[PDB]
């Protein structure tokens, strides 16, 4: 509502990555699949608590309004910095400070996406301001701010 | 003689002064049904009828008419060698199934109409169309229906009509025969209408235990298509029945016309397409931001 149309579209895209069967809700199992696909290791109790914290109407799954309102949370600026940094480290598998096309491809494969190598290169170029072919920390931050 | 040409086997059935036995042509091994008539028991009048019947059957060669292949006269016995059929009477198949689907009824009546049209083209009026006189050539779901029992058939000259006698089967009799009027080829088309009606719902259009009342109903054309059984039957089927069960024989549909009715012969959409100018552009930045946002969310549990 106070988000732009493009901001809403970006969150719909994120939502589609969680909602694997495309039924318009995210289950606990769906949440766990994404988390583990991104190298995160929550317990089953932790996953259910995450669902419970976001599930306003208490029907056991997260719909898009619930998913939105969650990240319509204007949390601390220090918390957003932390999220961006830890996210960077997820993409940068070898820890060299640069996200390569190969590394991005691996993340998208892990997430279940089927993209061509050209689409992945195009994605790198959207963030790769200095044009070296990789996304460094500063570029990654610029993109998300 | 007969026994030099045909090997006879078991009895298949009986008739008036007659038995039908399976038989086999000796040199070829092909099987038939031999109708064996004991002519020592026939009056001259009955032999004259047999003579007419055999003459008429010899004349008719058609896939929907039981074929007479041979007529052999011996002392006291006359042999008529017909197609063997193993599917029984259409009558019994109707009883077994209750009634036919419209697809199956149309296909059945189409063959019956071809048999009747062939008769009529050859100057023959059968006069006794009914399911009891129509035989299924084999037990196949696709078996041909074959017209049989030409014992009442008559030879007519073109479309000339006359009083040919009160003959036929009560429920199938035409109004013109019941009125004792001159008649002709159209009596078979009236009977066809009675059969189609029976095919579709499993009971006849005219029936009464008192035959006088039956005859009154027929002459009046007192039939209808009652609910609920007729409710799902298409109006095209009812229309064809109407045209067959027409009391005035000059206005009744002929076999050839009935074969062109849409319910019989017409049983078996383009839209503009828009130009595609291009494909939708992949949105690289939204794809990447969605993935990054997903990962940011995923890392909260590890941080918190
Ligand atoms: C039409 N009349 C019943 S008939 O006697 O002139 C006649 C004419 C042609 C026929 C048969 C009977 C006939 C009779 C028949 C009876 C049965 C069979 N065919 C197959 C085995 C079970 C019972 C047959 O195969 N071809
Ligand atoms: Ca789902
Ligand atoms: Ca919910
Ligand atoms: Ca790297
Ligand atoms: Ca770069």
Numbering used by the authors:
A (entry chain D): 3 to 147
B (entry chain A): -1 to 0, 11 to 276, 281 to 316
Publication excerpt:
CaMKII proteins form large oligomeric structures. The N-terminal kinase domain is tethered via an autoinhibitory helix and a calmodulin binding site to a C-terminal oligomerization domain that organizes the enzyme into ring-shaped oligomers.
We were interested in exploring the structural consequences of Ca2+/CaM binding on CaMKII and determined the structure of the CaMKIIδ/Ca2+/CaM complex. The structure of the complex comprised the catalytic and the regulatory domain of CaMKII (residues 1–333) and full length human calmodulin, and was refined at 1.9 Å resolution to an R/Rfree of 16.1 and 19.9%, respectively. In the complex, the regulatory region no longer interacted with its corresponding catalytic domain. Instead, the conformation of the inhibitory region adopted an extended conformation, in sharp contrast to its helical secondary structure in autoinhibited CaMKII. The observed extended conformation allowed interaction between the inhibitory region and the substrate binding site of an adjacent catalytic domain. In the complex, helix αD blocked the access to the binding site for the inhibitory helix by a significant reorientation of this helix with respect to the autoinhibited kinase; E106 and Y107, for instance, are displaced by more than 10 Å from their position (Cα) in the autoinhibited kinase and block the binding groove for the inhibitory helix. Residues in the interface were well-defined and the recognition motif bound tightly within the central cavity of the Ca2+/CaM structure while no stable contacts were made with the kinase domain.
